[PDB]
Write a protein that binds this ligand. Structure first.
Ligand SMILES: C[C@H](CCC(=O)NCCC[N+](C)(C)C[C@H](O)CS(=O)(=O)O)[C@H]1CC[C@H]2[C@@H]3[C@H](O)C[C@@H]4C[C@H](O)CC[C@]4(C)[C@H]3C[C@H](O)[C@]12C
Ligand SMILES: Nc1ccn([C@@H]2O[C@H](COP(=O)(O)OP(=O)(O)OP(=O)(O)O)[C@@H](O)[C@H]2O)c(=O)n1
Ligand SMILES: [Mg+2]
Ligand SMILES: [Mg+2]
Ligand SMILES: [Mg+2]
Ligand SMILES: [Mg+2]
Ligand SMILES: [Zn+2]
Ligand SMILES: [Zn+2]
Lengths: 1367, 334, 48, 96
DNA sequence: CTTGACAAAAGTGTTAAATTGTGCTATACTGGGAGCTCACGGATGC
DNA sequence: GCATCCGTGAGTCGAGGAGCACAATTTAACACTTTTGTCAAG
């Protein structure tokens, strides 16, 4: 009784009626006066249940004693009122209606089975053309009619009702034909009209009757209101009626005996029929249908000779058989449902299997697509005709509520309107059918009924969307409810609004510890209200919980002891601080709340970078974990002081920042004086004497005898750091003056600030020796050095001491930056003297370029390029001049120190402040010829400011229009790798990847060592697959590569001892539904082997997508997201490179006509016709390999896969995606990209079915076919020959086994349509499926590896063991 | 093509040529003769006239079928003088179908003047078709009036009734819909005459006797259409009325908790009572079976008379008052 | 285009009356608008 | 919203953060006990004010809404167990 | 704990008054009308 | 080649919302019992 799997399948009309507690027969919702729901309506209590718990409609039963009872007076079951959310109804359709999902979802599921195209299916379903279901021997245009043939309305009318036409004669003229005379096509009936069909021409309305009496051509005038009652050429006896009339006064009779002749017809009706006069009463009547040989009229004497509808003319005393066939052709879902009922899926499968052997590829592909649907219906057990609705389910009323609001007016959902229209049209069709309405009225209503069902199921899918009258807003249908960003999945299942949650503005708390946050008292009172009420009840504050809650309702009613109790409540507990967007996992962190006075949240400075939270108006969400599990997970796993390293790269993420770095850099940097700067002496006493004379400065570099030192190193020699800092306090020396100190038995020559920094680390880590090895004393502490210190401290000491060191660095960095005296003035943006000289040099060269152009030595495009190169060169020269001036003359300049330390700014921004702004681009992308020669200190001109505004707008627009692309990419990556979890320690695989230490350098055409960040991002925290012998050090198999091991491997590569490192990677992992511990490697956030049960798939997607989104909100516009999304989607590039399908020697045949490249082998010679504008990277006399590029550009991933193999494309995809993130300085481990690429290469295509039921070209997971192949091999069968397949993250995520995860991602209509027909059963393997059902995710503490752990003290364990083994 | 249902319908009805006045009279005469023939058939053969007209209609339309042939063959078994009335009945039904088919342009011209009143254009036509069918049944050609003169009354009648019955989510009776329409028309005439929105007193006075400001306000309140739960607010397409309407039906966690707190505190207080005295109150107040019982009904369960139980029920009630006064552990839940 | 008046301070209301919007009935769409519609043109000098 | 005294939206990316952390039970509480598990949220609040630990959560009401809305589309969505037997998540309130 | 009076609230009937649903109206009338810096790449279809 | 469907980041504070005549039916008002609680002693 634990939901372990969710199955979706088609619902039969029988099953739909089993769900329903009653048929909804009326569109009425509620009574307009009493507001009580109407009987038999959309809100009927008899169907969906009582409005209020245990109470009938009549109010006779009103208590739980009569549970499970239905009142006889009203019929409402006495039960809970919540059953109205779960009890469904149904609408019994007068005529069947097709489900729009199985019609308009390309490729059509109904059309696939019936072999009907989308055009043909729509025409039949919406009553445009008939379809033949029984020809009944019908002949159309001389060709017999066959089954499944489409007939237009005109064609059906001719076959079913015969061919006939009426010709209106001009008034007065008499036709030359007689009544009951056959004519031919084109024959003249009257002298003004001609026939168009051969048949019996009969008089319609003879305007004048000319009776010939026997005594006499007496003429009678026939008015429209009078009708002739006798035949033409009929002997009428004296007295018999001739022409009848409404008024007997004008009625015309026969005076004497005579013969009646009809003349001047209103029109002649020529019908293709057969006339048979009858002697006695007719054995048939009007409207019947006869076939050759049937006894027609005269008791067997007169018999039919042709098919047709028989109509008898009483006046003419003849029987007319209008030539027609009783063809069985219907429109709409009625015919379609019958077709699906007659299908023999077993017979259809056999025919499709036979057609699957056609050597034509197109027919096999078409047969495969049809056979996949046929196989789906057979295996699922569904029936094809279930796709047509005979009974439409009705949603429970509480899910489509009609609720009164805070006022008095009613609010209702759009589903009630859609249900009402369906009921209104269904009931009207039932009435129309009962009245025997004509076919056009019935056909229009059946078509409208079909559209009503379509609008309810999926509004706007076919035709114009349905809008509520009085507005143009489309009504929200069932498909719209479950699909889209605002659908049920993404808005209510994958994410929810939660209780015990708050939000406020965040301010900086420097006095907080790394694990602490400042939570306002008023937020904490509300967030911890249930816990607080219990605590007040425990103490004497309140008598009980309810009195406690009333006490807290009014602010003035809260005493001072409530706050004391609130302190006791939150003791030990932690809360989750959240800042949106949660790009990575450290966007939610657990903090120990500290109650503060105010309304803003105090955030620790060190967690700001991880949260991407500054204090210009940011807000955060607060969440309170409730149970012991939730608190334990937050305090152990999610605590801020426990997540110190970045999961994406492994480098520290909580590290000193802007103000902290500045304070530490300022005191650790030393002074460089220029007063003395070079004088040489003989004895130190002479040097000291010179200093007292003012000739040489304290820190001026001098030479005493042979060694280069300073006066400070000689004049001030301190026995210990305490004395050195004592001299600083008394003002003898500053923290930046280089002196001589004795520390740890070494006579160091450093500044007191550097010695002070050494003590700062030593006291923080509480171990002098290790802290000495962790720090770099002889350099100023920039961002990079501090980051290395945090990482090294983490490795040597752990999280607790590193967090203590982090807090110590934060305190001293803040303290020293405050008193140091960092400030920004207008003069701090020092203008170099070289700027004026450079601009004059540029102006002279610009004039020289202009003079050369005036003489015609270079074109417009070349001159524009020459101008740009000159200005780009000048801009770079000024940047160097700006920073050279700072380094030589103002080493402590605030702009220089901030830029050098990494606290703030970059040389590009410092140049704009100090040098020149530079070149700017037009809105079209072209750069202006004139640069912005003025910096921000000098002030731009009005024109230069307008020119500079084009790029500021262009950059700001990208910051807004590329976030959606990156956020969409992150969702794709999450949904394709959400199921990847470390599920076991080792999968036992012997495969691996060889991470290259040398990359081919094309410009040099040789192998060069890759960058350290390249090798570290590909080898750090990875298990060695094979033993490596480097530099006399044995790195054995199975050894996790630490950072020291990576550096040793890099050092060995520099010595030419190793070219590539074999490591275990997720690409070669054999673990099903995830990776193993030995193939993933380290948990980069802890620098230790990954723990079993970690959702590395979610970590991988967040690690990749965070830099994409983070950087675009601050490059990625051109070759960032466009290339990464293209690579992750495995899209074919527009300007794709040309690769050789085979290996061999190249032979270029460049000519004026075209460019052609020949790849020559022993017997093979491939020809590649390149375009003229092709940048070839290979020349004649080279040995190219298969898949090696021949032209510069982006390699098509699919062409490379089929030319080289799965390993090559995986290497190419990981490398090229990395090349992007490296360009913008992002460090990201290869594991996360390889996890996503592993999901891309997860599927294969069948090429030879073998001894299996798979189809050629069928796509299935590689793990399944490999398992299938070994099963076939086990029982001695031909294995399935498959082919590796590559697909993008979107296609891979949509083709997963689980329909719940796929439906929540995209194509909810398509995913659910394919799943329901196939009867797919979701095993709930990944994370999204468990989130949707609210289960415990199979990762982290919810993994089967750790979930069943038992904890017990020894006393109970000894007691249980003793009391059980005693027997 | 075929994506506009109105265009497809108009093309379908355009395939039936309009009836000349001679054709109209002939078809109208056949329907009346056919209907009379069905009456003559029933009177003689004995079956239900409604039964026979369905059998005749079934044969004409073609395609309970078990009994239709049984009745149809029975009718054909009549002699010649009676089989004749069958023939007029068949032609009359065939002429009724043709007469209805050829007037499908009339309903469209009538129905196009009723759009925008809560029903779609096709819904008006189909309702107009129902009125057109009724017009044919009741039409009499003896009066020499053309069909469009009499059909127009039935076509507009069916369209008006459908609007009064299907244009509102909360259905309002026809008499009240007429009152609402009359009220709106009266208000508009006053509004265009007084140059401002009329007050309820002004609207009631113009309406006539029996109308006051209270009745006008109630009728306007009744005429308030329900508002959709999915109507967006603001330019952002992420907020709807459904996101701001709380659910007041299901008890809140606080309400469910205090109910449990009261229940456990009441049973604890009832422990101090006697075994029978606590039983009487829990049964008189309906704490066991769920429903309040009577002194007589409680009496049958213990075999005690009505008057005695009231005394012990009151005595047990007084003891709880004594216990609550000495503890005050139950006052706060009130 | 009929927007709730922003009158935090007199400058707020003054700005709101001088704002030019490419959206509204008959204009562009917030999501269907490209980079070209949103970029500063050379002719905005002195006008926008 | 603050005006409606509403909760904080714990969207997809926030759910991803808990999944990446491995906080399976913290995620389950927010999905069920603190959002839409009507029986769970009533029992959790009652447990807290009694000084007890909150009970194990149950199926969310949003999933029940999803199943019924899927049933309104004539799709037979059935929750099964280890032995493929149907499991009633509606507590017998929808079984005719 | 019983028996007998006593109001009396709750329960069973009656005709009345709104209230709601239904059919009819006869010169002749016979194919709608609304909307128009389309946003743009990408994938699966004939 | 193109026709069509599907996709296009996350939170948040406000601002918002034809007429009448007739039969048929249900809703109210009026009486007359019924059952049902309250004293009354014994
Ligand atoms: C080594 C020294 C004690 C030596 C001894 O006990 N004998 C310990 C005892 C108390 C410690 C300071 C306080 O914590 C406040 C503050 C905390 C920051 O995190 C880092 C800076 C501060 C100033 C600390 C520095 C240093 O760590 C101190 C002086
Ligand atoms: N449409 C937006 C705008 C902003 N943000 C978030 O809010 C931040 C706002 O950053 P911004 O103030 O524009 O720049 P900073 O990065 O703070 O600038 P600096 O580095 O100079 O401090 C973004 O980085 C992002 O985290 C967002 O999610 N969506
Ligand atoms: Mg900032
Ligand atoms: Mg900010
Ligand atoms: Mg000295
Ligand atoms: Mg806005
Ligand atoms: Zn009842
Ligand atoms: Zn593995």
């Amino acid at each position: 009784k634990e939901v372990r799997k969710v199955r979706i399948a088609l619902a039969s009309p029988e099953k739909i009626r089993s769900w329903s507690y009653g048929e909804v027969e009326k569109p009425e919702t509620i009574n307009y006066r009493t507001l009580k729901p109407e009987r038999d309506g959309l809100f009927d209590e008899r169907i969906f249940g009582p409005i209020k718990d245990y109470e009938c409609a009549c109010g006779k039963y009103k208590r739980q004693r009569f549970e499970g009872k239905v009142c006889e007076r009203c019929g409402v079951e006495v039960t809970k009122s919540i059953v109205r959310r779960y009890r469904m109804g149904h609408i019994e359709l007068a005529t069947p209606a097709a489900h729009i999902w199985f019609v308009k979802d390309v490729p059509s599921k109904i059309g696939t089975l019936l072999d009907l195209s989308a055009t043909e299916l729509e025409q039949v379903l919406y009553f445009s053309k008939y379809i033949v279901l029984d020809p009944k021997g019908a002949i159309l245009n001389g060709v017999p009619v066959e089954k499944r043939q489409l007939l237009t309305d005109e064609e059906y009318r001719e076959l079913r009702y015969g061919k006939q036409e009426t010709y209106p004669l001009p008034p007065g003229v008499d036709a030359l034909v007689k009544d009951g005379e056959e004519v031919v096509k084109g024959q003249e009936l009257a002298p003004g009209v001609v026939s168009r069909l051969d048949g019996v021409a009969l008089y319609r309305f003879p305007r004048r009757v000319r009776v010939e009496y026997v005594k006499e051509p007496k003429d009678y005038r026939v008015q429209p209101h009078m009708n002739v009652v006798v035949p033409e050429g009929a002997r009428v006896e004296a007295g018999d009626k001739i022409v009848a009339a409404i008024d007997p006064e004008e009625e015309v009779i026969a005076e004497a005996e005579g013969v009646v002749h009809l003349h001047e017809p209103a029109s002649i009706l020529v019908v293709k029929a057969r006339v048979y006069p009858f002697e006695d009463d007719v054995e048939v009547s009007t409207g019947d249908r006869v076939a050759p040989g049937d006894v027609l009229a005269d008791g067997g004497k007169v018999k039919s000779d042709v098919y047709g509808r028989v109509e008898v003319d009483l006046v003419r005393n003849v029987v007319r058989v209008v030539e027609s066939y009783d063809i069985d052709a219907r429109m709409g879902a009625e015919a379609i449902q019958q077709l699906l009922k007659e299908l023999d899926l077993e017979a259809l499968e056999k025919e499709l299997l036979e057609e699957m052997k056609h050597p034509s590829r197109a027919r096999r592909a078409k047969a495969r697509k049809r056979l996949e649907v046929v196989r789906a219906f057979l295996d699922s057990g569904n029936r094809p005709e279930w796709m047509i609705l005979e009974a439409v389910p009705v949603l429970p009323p509480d899910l489509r509520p009609m609720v009164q609001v805070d006022g008095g007016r009613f609010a209702t959902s759009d589903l009630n309107d859609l249900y009402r229209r369906l009921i209104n049209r269904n009931n009207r069709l039932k009435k129309l059918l009962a009245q025997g309405a004509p076919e056009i009225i019935i056909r229009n209503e059946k078509r409208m009924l079909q559209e009503a069902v379509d609008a309810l199921l999926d509004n706007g899918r076919r035709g114009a969307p349905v809008t509520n009258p009085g507005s143009d807003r489309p009504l929200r249908s069932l498909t719209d409810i479950l699909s889209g960003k605002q659908g049920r999945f993404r808005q209510n299942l994958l994410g929810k609004r939660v209780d015990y949650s708050g939000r406020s503005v965040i301010v900086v708390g420097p006095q907080l510890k790394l694990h602490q946050c400042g939570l306002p008292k008023r937020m904490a009172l509300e967030l911890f209200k249930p816990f607080l009420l219990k605590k007040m009840e425990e103490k004497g504050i309140a008598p009980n919980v309810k009195a406690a809650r009333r006490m807290l309702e009014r602010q003035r009613d809260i005493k001072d002891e409530v706050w004391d109790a609130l302190e006791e409540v939150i003791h030990g507990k932690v809360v989750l601080l959240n800042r949106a967007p949660t790009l990575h996992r450290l966007g939610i962190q657990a903090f120990q709340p500290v109650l503060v006075e105010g309304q803003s949240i105090q955030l620790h400075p060190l967690v700001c970078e991880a949260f991407n939270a500054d204090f210009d108006g940011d807000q955060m969400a607060v969440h309170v974990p409730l149970s012991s599990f939730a608190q334990a997970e937050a305090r152990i796993q999610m605590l801020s002081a426990h997540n110190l390293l970045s999961p994406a790269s492994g480098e520290p993420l909580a590290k000193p920042s802007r103000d902290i770095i500045l304070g530490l850099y300022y005191i650790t940097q030393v002074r460089k004086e220029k007063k003395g700067a070079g004088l040489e002496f003989a004895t130190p006493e002479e040097a000291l004497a010179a200093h007292e004379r003012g000739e040489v400065a304290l820190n001026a570099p001098i030479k005493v005898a042979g060694r280069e030192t300073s006066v400070g190193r000689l004049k001030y020699v301190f026995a210990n750091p305490d004395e050195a800092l004592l001299a600083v306090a008394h003002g003898i020396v500053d923290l930046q003056d280089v002196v001589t100190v004795r520390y740890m038995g070494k006579r160091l020559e450093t500044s007191p600030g550097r010695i002070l920094f050494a003590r700062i680390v030593a006291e923080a880590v509480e171990d002098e020796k290790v802290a000495w090895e962790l720090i770099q004393l002889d350099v100023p502490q920039e961002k990079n050095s501090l980051k290395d210190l945090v990482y090294q401290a983490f490795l040597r000491l752990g999280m607790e001491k590193t967090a203590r060191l982090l807090d110590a660095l934060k305190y001293y960095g803040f303290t020293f930056s405050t008193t140091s005296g960092i400030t920004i003035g207008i003069d701090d943006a020092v203008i170099p003297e070289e700027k004026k000289q450079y601009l004059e040099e540029a102006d002279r060269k610009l004039l020289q370029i202009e003079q050369a152009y005036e003489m015609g030595f270079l074109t417009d495009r070349e001159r524009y390029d020459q101008i740009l190169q000159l200005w780009t060169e000048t801009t770079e020269k000024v940047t160097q001049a700006v920073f050279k001036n700072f380094e030589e003359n103002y080493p402590f300049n605030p702009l220089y120190v901030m830029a050098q330390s990494g606290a703030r700014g970059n040389p590009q921004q410092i140049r704009q402040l100090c040098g020149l702004r530079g070149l700017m681009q037009k809105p079209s992308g072209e750069t202006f010829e004139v640069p912005v020669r003025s910096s921000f200190r000098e002030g731009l001109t009005v024109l230069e400011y307008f020119i500079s505004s084009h790029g500021a707008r262009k950059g700001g627009a990208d910051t807004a229009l590329r976030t959606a692309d990156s956020g969409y990419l992150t969702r794709k990556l999450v949904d394709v790798t959400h199921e990847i979890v470390v599920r076991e320690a080792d999968c036992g695989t012997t495969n691996y990847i060889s991470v290259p230490l040398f990359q081919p350098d094309e410009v040099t055409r040789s192998l060069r060592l890759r960058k350290r960040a390249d090798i570290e991002a590909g080898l750090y925290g990875r298990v060695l697959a094979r033993e490596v012998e480097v530099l006399g050090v044995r790195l054995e198999e199975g050894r996790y590569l630490s950072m020291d091991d990576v550096h040793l491997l890099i050092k060995a590569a520099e010595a030419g001892e190793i070219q590539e490192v074999p490591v275990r990677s997720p690409l070669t992992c054999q673990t099903r539904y995830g990776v193993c511990q030995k193939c993933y490697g380290y948990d980069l956030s802890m620098a230790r082997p990954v723990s079993i049960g970690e959702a590395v798939g979610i970590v991988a997607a967040q690690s990749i997508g965070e830099p994409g989104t983070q950087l675009t909100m601050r490059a990625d516009i051109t070759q960032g997201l466009p290339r990464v999304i293209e690579l992750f989607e495995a899209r074919r590039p527009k300007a794709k490179a040309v690769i050789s399908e085979i290996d061999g020697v190249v032979r270029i045949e460049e000519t004026e006509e075209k460019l052609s490249v020949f790849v020559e082998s022993e017997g093979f010679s491939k020809e590649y016709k390149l375009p003229k504008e092709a940048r070839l990277l290979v020349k004649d006399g080279d040995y190219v390999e298969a898949g090696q590029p021949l032209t510069r550009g982006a390699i098509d991933p699919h062409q490379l896969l089929e030319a080289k193999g799965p390993e090559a494309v995986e290497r190419y995809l990981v490398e090229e995606i990395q090349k992007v993130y490296r360009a913008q300085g992002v460090k990201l481990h290869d594991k996360h990209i390889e996890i996503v690429v592993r999901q891309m290469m997860k599927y294969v295509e069948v090429t030879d079915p073998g001894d299996s039921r798979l189809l050629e070209g069928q796509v299935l997971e590689k793990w399944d076919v490999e398992a299938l192949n070994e099963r076939l091999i086990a029982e001695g069968k031909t294995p399935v020959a498959w082919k590796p397949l590559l697909m993008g993250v979107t296609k891979s995520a949509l083709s997963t086994k689980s329909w719940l995860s796929a439906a929540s991602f995209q194509n909810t209509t398509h995913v659910l349509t394919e799943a329901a027909i196939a009867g797919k059963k979701d095993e709930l393997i990944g994370l999204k499926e468990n989130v949707i059902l609210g289960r415990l995710i199979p990762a982290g503490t919810g993994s089967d590896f750790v979930r069943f752990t038992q904890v017990v003290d020894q006393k109970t364990l000894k007691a249980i063991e003793e009391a059980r083994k005693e027997a | 093509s075929t994506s506009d249902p109105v265009r497809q319908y108009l093309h379908e009805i355009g395939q039936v040529p309009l009836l000349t006045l001679e054709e109209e009279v002939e078809l109208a005469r056949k329907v009346e003769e056919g209907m009379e023939a069905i009456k003559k058939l029933s009177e003689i053969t004995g079956l239900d006239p409604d039964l026979i007209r369905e059998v005749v209609r079934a044969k004409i339309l073609g395609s309970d079928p078990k009994t239709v042939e049984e009745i149809d063959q029975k009718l054909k078994s009549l002699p010649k003088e009676h089989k004749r009335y069958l023939h007029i009945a068949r032609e009359g039904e065939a002429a009724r179908q043709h007469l209805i088919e050829a007037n499908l342009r009339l309903v469209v011209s009538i129905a196009k003047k009723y759009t925008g009143r809560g029903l779609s254009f096709l819904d008006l036509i189909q309702e107009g078709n129902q009125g057109l069918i009724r017009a044919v049944e009741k039409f009499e050609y003896k009066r020499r009036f053309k069909f469009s003169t009499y059909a127009t009354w039935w076509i507009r009648q069916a369209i008006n009734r459908a609007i009064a019955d299907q244009a509102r989510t909360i259905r309002i009776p026809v008499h009240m819909v007429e009152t609402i329409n009359k009220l709106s028309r009266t208000a508009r005439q006053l509004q265009q005459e007084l140059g401002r929105e009329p007050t309820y007193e002004e609207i009631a006075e113009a309406m006539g006797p029996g109308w006051d400001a209270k009745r006008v306000e109630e009728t306007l309140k009744i005429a308030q259409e329900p508002v959709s739960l999915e109507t967006p607010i603001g330019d952002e397409k992420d907020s709807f009325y459904g996101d701001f309407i709380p659910d007041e039906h299901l008890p809140s966690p606080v309400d469910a908790a205090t109910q449990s707190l009261l229940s456990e505190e009441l049973e604890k207080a009832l422990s101090k009572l006697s075994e029978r005295e606590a039983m009487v109150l829990k049964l008189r107040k309906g704490l066991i079976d769920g429903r309040e019982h009577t002194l007589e009904e409680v009496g049958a369960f213990f075999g005690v008379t009505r008057e005695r139980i009231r005394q012990i029920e009151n005595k047990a009630l007084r003891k709880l008052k004594y216990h609550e006064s000495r503890t005050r552990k139950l006052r706060d839940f009130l | 285009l009929s927007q709730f008046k922003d009158e935090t301070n007199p400058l707020s209301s003054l700005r709101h009356k001088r704002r030019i919007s490419a959206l509204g009935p008959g204009g562009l769409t917030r999501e269907r608008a490209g980079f070209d519609v949103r970029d500063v043109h050379r002719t905005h000098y002195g006008r926008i | 919203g603050k005006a409606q005294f509403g909760g904080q939206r714990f969207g997809e990316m926030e759910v991803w953060a808990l999944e990446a952390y491995g906080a399976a039970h913290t995620l389950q509480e927010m999905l069920t006990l603190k959002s839409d598990d009507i029986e769970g949220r009533n029992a959790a609040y009652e447990a807290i004010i009694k000084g007890e630990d909150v009970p194990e959560p149950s199926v969310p009401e949003s999933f029940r809404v999803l199943v019924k809305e899927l049933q309104a589309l004539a799709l037979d969505v059935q929750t099964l167990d280890e032995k493929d037997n149907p499991v009633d998540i509606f507590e017998g309130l929808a079984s005719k």
